[PDB]
A paper describes a structure:
Several proteins from plant pathogenesis-related family 10 (PR10) are highly abundant in the latex of opium poppy and have recently been shown to play diverse and important roles in the biosynthesis of benzylisoquinoline alkaloids (BIAs). PR10-10 has been proposed to act as a noncatalytic BIA binding protein. We observed that an intermolecular disulfide bond between Cys59 and Cys155 is formed in the apo structure, while the binding of alkaloid compounds to the central hydrophobic pocket induces conformational changes that prevent the formation of this intermolecular disulfide bond.
To decouple ligand binding from disulfide-bond formation, each of the two highly conserved cysteine residues (Cys59 and Cys155) in PR10-10 was replaced with serine using site-directed mutagenesis. A crystal structure of the Cys155Ser mutant was also determined in the absence of exogenous BIA compounds. Attempts to crystallize the Cys59Ser and Cys155Ser mutants of PR10-10 in the absence of BIA ligands surprisingly yielded crystals with the morphology characteristic of PR10-10 with bound BIA ligands. Data processing confirms that these crystals show C2221 space-group symmetry, and structure determination and refinement reveal a closed cap-loop conformation similar to the structures of PR10-10 with bound BIA ligands. Despite the absence of exogenously added ligands during crystallization, there appears to be electron density in the hydrophobic pocket corresponding to an unidentified compound. Mutation of either Cys59 or Cys155 was associated with the binding of an unknown molecule in the absence of an alkaloid ligand, whereas similar conditions for the purification, storage and crystallization of wild-type PR10-10 resulted in the apo conformation. Although holo PR10-10 and cysteine-mutant PR10-10 structures all showed closed cap-loop conformations, and slight differences in the cap position from residues 37–40 were observed, it should be noted that residues 34–36 in wild-type PR10-10, residues 35–36 in PR10-10-Cys155Ser and residues 34–36 in PR10-10-Cys59Ser–papaverine were not sufficiently well ordered to be modeled. The PR10-10-Cys59Ser and PR10-10-Cys155Ser structures demonstrated a similar cap-loop conformation, which was fully modeled for PR10-10-Cys59Ser. Residues 38–40 were shifted ∼3.8 Å perpendicularly away from the central α2 helix in the PR10-10 cysteine mutants compared with wild-type holo PR10-10.
Author numbering:
A (entry chain A), B (entry chain A): 8 to 34, 37 to 114, 117 to 157
């Protein structure tokens, strides 16, 4: 089982398009972290994404990652493509996809971690899944109606 | 974020229908556990599922659960419906759905935990997700071609 996907899906009381625009322009200050990096444009001058080098602390351990982020407004989807860092000691591929859709009924938010392990001895990224989950729960608790 | 779903999805080198029949009739002896219970029939005499009371040790702690299992051969789906036990101290609802499908390309196996927390102070079931993940990885490593 070398190729796989972990998912955490949450219901949020908020319109999908609004919530996506919030997620797209926001990060969890309690968590030690910062980034440096650049904005990417499509060629008309308006940002289409970013490339960031993160310095962060996960389960007590300091780590780095380089991620390229792209977005698709029409499907309310953010994609983080990790190319380098501590995660690449365990994974050949590590992508994080964030989707927001309206309930058939507010909204449903889906974090997916699409991964390929280096070898069988690599863990699956349950530590990252819980991290992203708690971060989006925290951000969702500071948003409210009206 | 009280209602949600956790998913672990794995690729396995095995035909989907065969793998489903394996999963359907198998349990991880390393893990302390046993069950008692009964078989359920649809009314023609052939088993359609089971109702089991599990005694198991999760992350060092002894727990119990009562689960009703049903299956759908045509969609290769097993459904475990938990009605009682330690998990119900955290969740109003706790269902585990196991699906096996062929790759568009072997197979893709999907464990989903569909949950509703009692309150905001309840955890999401990352401990169960990792447990089910490692159990299906273990079972998949003992299966091989030909």
């Amino acid at each position: 089982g070398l190729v796989g996907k972990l998912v955490t899906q949450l219901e949020v009381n908020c319109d999908a398009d609004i919530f996506y625009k919030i997620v797209k322009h926001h990060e969890p200050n309690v968590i030690p972290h910062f980034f440096t990096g650049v904005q990417v444009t499509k060629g008309d001058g308006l940002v289409s994404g970013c490339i960031k080098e993160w310095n962060y602390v996960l389960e007590g351990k300091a780590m780095t990652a380089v991620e390229e982020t792209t977005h698709a407004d029409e499907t309310r989807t953010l994609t983080h493509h990790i190319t380098e860092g501590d995660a690449m000691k365990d994974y050949k591929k590590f992508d994080v996809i964030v989707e927001t859709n309206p309930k058939p009924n507010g909204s449903v938010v889906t974090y997916s971690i699409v991964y390929e392990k280096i070898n069988e001895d690599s863990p699956a990224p349950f530590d990252y899944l819980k991290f992203f989950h708690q971060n989006i729960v925290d951000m969702s608790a500071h948003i409210s109606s009206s």
